[PDB]
């Protein structure tokens, strides 16, 4: 990403367009979007014992 100079000379007309594409830091985006997933592991008390 750097600046530059455009110099145009002569009869006529045209269109200039400049687009930058890059990696932008995430906007606190959670990869677990749309899902509230909860996992719990616990030893069994005495219900089996």
From Swiss-Prot:
Origin superkingdom: Eukaryota
Protein name: Complement C3c alpha' chain fragment 2
Species whose genome carries this gene: Homo sapiens
Gene symbol of the encoding locus: C3
First and last residues shown, out of full length: 1327 to 1375 of 1663
């Amino acid at each position: 990403n750097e600046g530059f100079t455009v110099t145009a000379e002569g009869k006529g007309q045209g269109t200039l367009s400049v687009v930058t594409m890059y990696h932008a830091k995430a906007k606190d985006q959670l990869t677990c979007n749309k899902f509230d997933l909860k996992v719990t592991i616990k030893p069994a008390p005495e219900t089996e014992k």
